Amino acid sequence: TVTIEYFNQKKEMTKTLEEITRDFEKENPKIKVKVVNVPNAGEVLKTRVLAGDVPDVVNIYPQSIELQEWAKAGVFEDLSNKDYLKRVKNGYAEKYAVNEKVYNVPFTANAYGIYYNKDKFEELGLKVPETWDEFEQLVKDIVAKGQTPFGIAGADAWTLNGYNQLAFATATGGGKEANQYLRYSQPNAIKLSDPIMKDDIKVMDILRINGSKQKNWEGAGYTDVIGAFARGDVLMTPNGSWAITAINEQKPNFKIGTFMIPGKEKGQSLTVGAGDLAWSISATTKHPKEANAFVEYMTRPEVMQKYYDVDGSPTAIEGVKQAGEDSPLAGMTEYAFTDRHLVWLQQYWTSEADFHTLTMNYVLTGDKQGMVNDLNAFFNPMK
Ligand SMILES: [Cl-]
Question: Hey, how many other C-beta atoms are within 10 angstroms of the C-beta on 227?
Fold first, then answer.
């Protein structure tokens, strides 16, 4: 009577997760599933995979450069041909393929965008923008109506990771494009007078209209910026869809909305993000058939639905009933799991930290050339 391991990385869902684990078992009396929640679970897993003590089912983040390397070594089962994969939106899992196969079932994913105060927007007669020029005017117009366009956490450069990645993606037409310009170009090819660069500069200057941000944003942090937002201290703030929960808790006094960053024209906005509840399988598990049994469980609607009514992140499984056109994340996720919902660019980076910093530095100083330099310094050791 067999027993298998799900090395879970999603620590905050572990209740509803074991909850599920049981009622899968409640009806598979010939399978055990023990649910691993070790601290330092990132480095635990790396050591083991490499030590060849690989878990039966892994919650592994598919943008990871573990997964690229592990898959292209032979650690995971090829799931391209599974039928429960039919159940993912669009081509969606294919966006993490290795050598044209799929090795991970992305059940849910984050996204990134601009949160905004609707009541505000209503009373001030203000429209969600749909082009860089409109965004820029929206910020000017708010400053003029005597309020604060942005909450910006000057001390958490990562809060603007998405914003800048979306700047390059909208300016170049998508992830593949953005990474061509940035990462797969020759060394020192990023140049201040590139049309793209000028565009990117432009998206970033929206963050430095005069008056755009809240007092002392310079040294503000995430949890701070959440507050300003829920208070009304500002009308907007760039961030992931993870924020919504935190934001809900200052019990804000108005209805929250979100919009996707626009590109240069209508119909051209874009959002970024990756798999969050996402699964792969050892190519070397004992009882393979059992693992596969359990993934296809999770892919069932009534199962997902049960995870979703609690987690609330956009889910790429069909026949789950998701929050509707006026949930707070409705705009931010209006094209999730399609091609206008890019995988995080750094999926093909050796790191990101330098990027979050060249990003805030620029918001902080305005130094255009500095950022171009910052950028090749960041990417150049890409040989
Ligand atoms: Cl300012």
Answer: 17
Give the Cα separation of 360 and 381 in Å (integer): 21
Start-to-end C-alpha separation, the chain = 51
Alpha carbon dihedral 179, 185, 190, 196, in 10-degree steps, equals: -50
Distance (Å) from CA 170 to ligand 1 centroid = 25
Under 8 Å between Cβ of 95 and 88: no
Q: Around ion ligand 1, which residues have CB less than 5 A away?
A: 213
Going by C-beta distance under 8 Å and a sequence separation of 6 or more, which residues neighbour residue 176?
Answer: none
Q: Do domains 1-111+275-329 and 112-274+330-383 have the same CATH topology?
A: yes
Give the residues across from 4 on adjacent strands: 33
Cα separation, 340 vs 36, in Å, equals 34
Q: How far is the CA of 122 from the centre of ligand 1 (A)?
A: 24
Ligand 1: centre distance to CA 207 (Å): 8
Does the domain made of 112-274+330-383 have the CATH classification 3.40.640.10? Answer: no
| Residue tagged 């039966």 (tokens) | 56
Residue 58 token pair: 């892994």
| CA–CA separation, 201 and 98 (whole Å) | 33
* Three-class SS state of 42: helix
**CA–CA gap between residue 73 and residue 327 (Å, rounded):** 42
Resolution in A: 2.9
- Residues linked to residue 133 through DSSP beta bridges, in sequence order: none
Other Cβ atoms within 10 Å of 357 Cβ, number: 16
Q: Report how far ligand 1's centroid is from the alpha carbon of 103 (Å).
A: 46
- Which position has the token pair 């027993």? 3
- Domain layout of the chain by residue ranges: 1-111+275-329, 112-274+330-383
Under 8 Å between Cβ of 335 and 271: yes
Q: What is the DSSP letter of 88?
A: B
- Biggest CA pair distance of the chain: 70
Q: How was this structure determined?
A: X-ray
Q: What share of the chain is helix, strand, coil (3-state, %, to 5)?
A: 45, 15, 40
Tell me the CATH architecture of domain 1-111+275-329: 3-Layer(aba) Sandwich (3.40)
CA of 184 to the centre of ligand 1 (A): 35
